Amino acid sequence: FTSDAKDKPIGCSVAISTYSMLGHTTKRSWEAERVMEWLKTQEWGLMILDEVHTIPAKMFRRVLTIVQAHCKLGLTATLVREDDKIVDLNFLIGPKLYEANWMELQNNGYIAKVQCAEVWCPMSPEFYREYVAIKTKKRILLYTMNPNKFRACQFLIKFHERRNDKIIVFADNVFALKEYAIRLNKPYIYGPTSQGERMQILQNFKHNPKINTIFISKVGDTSFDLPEANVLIQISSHGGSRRQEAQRLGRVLRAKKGMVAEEYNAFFYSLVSQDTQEMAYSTKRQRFLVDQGYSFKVITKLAGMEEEDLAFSTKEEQQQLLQKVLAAT
Amino acid sequence: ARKLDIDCVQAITGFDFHGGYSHPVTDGYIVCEEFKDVLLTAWENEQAVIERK
DNA sequence: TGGCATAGATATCGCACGTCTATTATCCTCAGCGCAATCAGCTGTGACTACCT
DNA sequence: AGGTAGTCACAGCTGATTGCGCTGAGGATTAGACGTGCGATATCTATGCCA
């Protein structure tokens, strides 16, 4: 029951739809109205809800009232909504039935044994002075565009490509993602995300060994399917969504054969700018992953960056980058 | 019409098939005769508004 | 002498081999909705001072 | 002259704000016909066979 692939609801034993298709307060298409009438008339023995953490929103909560079903079951990767709207969910659906131990599943090899790391990036003096000068929400651009952070990301990408690793780089900021991907000349996916070209890029990453570095915007959380990867580099995050980026880490890194015996077969890096507010976010966020026993070893400096030539070696380039960033306020 | 909540349908004229599928072809909107001139006035107003916008 | 088979001469209809435009329901785009950390104003609480006793 | 209510100066709570996601309307987008080529096939009659 989507707006693109339309099918007759009659005789449909299992009907699959989205919350928005049921949450449309505005007038729908005429056929959509008929299908909604059919759904409302029909009583469901089973209802299944995915990504339960999005349910507590008011529009999606109204969907439960809209639909009449006997058995409702919810599945997700996390259950800590940052707006603490979870107590109501205990009766929106019901009690938490089960929660597998992440470390135990790692031991059994059902999922990859992740190697987590937080990488601190020094701030350029001009960038840091500007960051201190600004006091409002506009500070996001400056530290997300740290030349040292760019150099660290470039070095990590080079090292893992030389290791022939699946590199997926997240960047919630639209502008930062564009600049990073373009300068590194790698595919980028953001708001537009033409679905055909989106799947084209995904298949290029999956099949072409020449291209194994995909830059993805915030849409990488739940807006599409993530092919199994091994190296996940997170540059910018929402700013305290302890469950969102933890879920992103869980979805990105999957079980891979070959290195099951080793305790570190999946590699995750979180780039954080030193002396910025971003640090306060990271410690705030990865707390959830700490609840699952995951550890994050601080890597102030990366070995090998000296010999390999990287971008922004001269500060004269870096001040031009500062020009570009400040141009967008 | 939907902005003014006026029931308006397409006017199925024929069939066109570019890649092998007979998509129905419509020429304008069928509306009730009662709101014909009101709809014309609304269209004129919205045309002027979108011009200045 | 005369009945008519037997093949020379010939199209003749059927099976098979070329094009052609449509006896009927697609593919991207912009406007309309939604979600999560600041920031600021409504309201509550303490410090300072007026008035009845 | 004496103390607690009115008034002003600051604090918690919550709604508005600003990045960002999703549908609905709207404008773009080779299968019987009609023949022939080839191939199997009915088709008509010379004329000399010997009774």
From Swiss-Prot, chain A:
Ranges of residues in domain Helicase C-terminal: 151-311
Binding-site positions, ATP: 251, 254
GO molecular function annotation: 3'-5' DNA helicase activity; ATP binding; ATP hydrolysis activity; damaged DNA binding; DNA binding; promoter-specific chromatin binding
Motif (DEVH box): 50-53
KW DNA repair (keyword) present: yes
Modified residues (Phosphoserine): 295
Family the UniProt entry places it in: Belongs to the helicase family. RAD25/XPB subfamily.
Record text on subunit structure and interactions: Component of the 7-subunit TFIIH core complex composed of XPB/ERCC3, XPD/ERCC2, GTF2H1, GTF2H2, GTF2H3, GTF2H4 and GTF2H5, which is active in NER. The core complex associates with the 3-subunit CDK-activating kinase (CAK) module composed of CCNH/cyclin H, CDK7 and MNAT1 to form the 10-subunit holoenzyme (holo-TFIIH) active in transcription. Interacts with PUF60. Interacts with ATF7IP. Interacts with KAT2A; leading to KAT2A recruitment to promoters and acetylation of histones. (Microbial infection) Interacts with Epstein-Barr virus EBNA2.
Misc remark: The TFIIH core complex from patient XP11BE (a patient with XP/CS who has a C-terminal splice-site frameshift from residue 741 in this protein) reconstitutes in vitro transcription about 30% less well than wild-type but does not restore NER in vitro or in vivo. The XP11BE TFIIH complex has all the subunits in the same stoichiometry as wild-type. Purified mutant protein has very weak 3'-5' helicase and ATPase activities. In another paper the mutant protein has wild-type 3'-5' helicase activity. The mutation is recessive to wild-type. Conventional DNA helicases unwind DNA by binding to a ssDNA overhang of dsDNA and then translocating on this strand with cycles of ATP binding and hydrolysis to 'unzip' the dsDNA. XPB/ERCC3 is believed to be an unconventional DNA helicase principally because it translocates in a 3'-5' direction along dsDNA instead of ssDNA, thus it is referred to as a DNA translocase.
Name of the protein in question: General transcription and DNA repair factor IIH helicase/translocase subunit XPB
Organism of this sequence: Homo sapiens (Human)
Gene: ERCC3
